Amino acid sequence: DWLKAFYDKVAEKLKEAF
| 5 Ramachandran zone, left/alpha/beta (phi>0; psi -120 to 50) | alpha
Experimental technique: NMR
Our CA angle for 16, 17, 18, nearest 5°, is 95
Specify burial of residue 4 (Cβ count, 10 A radius: 0-12, 13-18, 19+).
exposed
**Phi/psi of residue 17, each to 5°?**
-40, -70
**SS3 assignment, position 2:** helix
Residue 9's H or E segment, with its range, is helix 2-17
Per DSSP, 3 falls in state H
Q: Tell me the C-alpha to C-alpha distance, in Å, between residue 5 and each of 8, 14, 16.
A: 6, 14, 17
**DSSP label at residue 18:** -
At 1 the three-state DSSP class reads coil
